Design a binder for this molecule. Sequence first.
Ligand SMILES: C[n+]1cn([C@@H]2O[C@H](COP(=O)(O)OP(=O)(O)OP(=O)(O)OC[C@H]3O[C@@H](n4cnc5c(=O)[nH]c(N)nc54)[C@H](O)[C@@H]3O)[C@@H](O)[C@H]2O)c2nc(N)[nH]c(=O)c21
Ligand SMILES: C[n+]1cn([C@@H]2O[C@H](COP(=O)(O)OP(=O)(O)OP(=O)(O)OC[C@H]3O[C@@H](n4cnc5c(=O)[nH]c(N)nc54)[C@H](O)[C@@H]3O)[C@@H](O)[C@H]2O)c2nc(N)[nH]c(=O)c21
Ligand SMILES: Cn1cnc2c(O)nc(N)nc21
Length: 358
Amino acid sequence: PSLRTQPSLYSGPFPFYRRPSELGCFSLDAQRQYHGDARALRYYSPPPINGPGPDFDLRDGYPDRYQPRDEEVQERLDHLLRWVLEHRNQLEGGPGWLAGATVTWRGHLTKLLTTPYERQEGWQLAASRFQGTLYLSEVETPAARAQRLARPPLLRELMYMGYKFEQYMCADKPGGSPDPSGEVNTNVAYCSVLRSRLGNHPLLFSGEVDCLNPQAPCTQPPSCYVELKTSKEMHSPGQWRSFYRHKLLKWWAQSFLPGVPHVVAGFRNPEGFVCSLKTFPTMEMFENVRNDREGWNPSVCMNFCAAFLSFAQSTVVQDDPRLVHLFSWEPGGPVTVSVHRDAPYAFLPSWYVETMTQ
Ligand SMILES: C[n+]1cn([C@@H]2O[C@H](COP(=O)(O)OP(=O)(O)OP(=O)(O)OC[C@H]3O[C@@H](n4cnc5c(=O)[nH]c(N)nc54)[C@H](O)[C@@H]3O)[C@@H](O)[C@H]2O)c2nc(N)[nH]c(=O)c21
Ligand SMILES: C[n+]1cn([C@@H]2O[C@H](COP(=O)(O)OP(=O)(O)OP(=O)(O)OC[C@H]3O[C@@H](n4cnc5c(=O)[nH]c(N)nc54)[C@H](O)[C@@H]3O)[C@@H](O)[C@H]2O)c2nc(N)[nH]c(=O)c21
Ligand SMILES: Cn1cnc2c(O)nc(N)nc21
């Protein structure tokens, strides 16, 4: 069995998607150590009103003040599993809720959402059922590993610039001011843990959150969170159209899932400076392509994701943390499945399995 990904198969009514609820959070510090609190959370702090327009130098500090996380370390779901283990007897939904849920990272769900429209990058998701719960963990494809290692210097600096933009737009305390003189250390991360449900599939997932906005009228997470992005400056209706069709689809999918309502974009010029800022409310992103023959449709994204969750749940029958059903997909073909045991694909660690079993 396989699963088709064409948009035409998923263009029916928008499916049921539960308003996400934040169950908790965790932080990773500068050494990538886990802490079950919000210490890594930063606060939205835009340019002072009535002052100069934004003019952020995204190249400042590159590479001397850049401390990149080590990508050769495969973390898989480990940090989320630690959170689950530490909150297993405190989850909502009553007895057995976790046993009927699917657990994964927000980014993995985002890749599913954008699959019907993706033309460049394929993916692989390892799936294991354990105590009823279905766990989904991404596996690096051969192309992704090759690309990673051969990452152009331009692309490495572009990644830095995205994190640097966050530094210019956030303060360490509510109402504080940004401090661009510090290090951009990408081991640091703040993650929200959320409960949702797509169709008849309950979900427990976590996603990195860029900042909390103290100026937002809605103070309850995730309503108060803001996602921070950069993109090249655009000048023609054509450039804007391409951005609406391709980039906004990715921003929408990523923020829609956890219920983050606003994405603030810093548009950067060729010289590396952000000279304009614009808010894109997540719930209004689709409007830009609603009457576009070459646009994307949130319903297609969500109906495909629901179909994949049904396909994975029906395919992974065996409850065994050491067994993996690997779902693989490349543009142009369907999602295919292969079955494997133990290394290298098995991803649920003994420290988690043993504790949950006892
Ligand atoms: C090697 N590889 C396979 N997948 C995935 O596993 C599924 C089932 O195939 P499989 O290789 O598990 O089983 P067979 O059909 O028996 O293999 P067969 O092709 O008949 O080859 C016979 C034996 O030689 C191995 N093999 C063949 N060619 C290569 C190779 O170029 N590199 C490596 N590492 N192993 C190879 C293969 O793993 C198997 O043990 C594939 O559809 C992929 O999704 C991989 N995924 C990632 N991310 N990276 C990989 O390098 C990779
Ligand atoms: C991928 N990843 C996540 N963590 C961590 O795991 C937890 C969950 O994160 P998460 O699931 O919230 O991360 P996302 O940014 O949503 O995921 P990502 O796969 O990057 O994005 C999903 C989809 O969104 C797409 N996307 C979102 N925004 C953009 C965009 O601005 N441009 C483009 N081209 N694509 C975008 C992206 O292409 C992809 O298809 C956090 O603690 C993270 O630190 C990772 N840690 C390490 N060491 N290495 C990693 O590659 C890594
Ligand atoms: C900005 N940007 C370019 N690629 C990205 C990716 O893969 N993930 C995230 N979150 N942002 C990206």
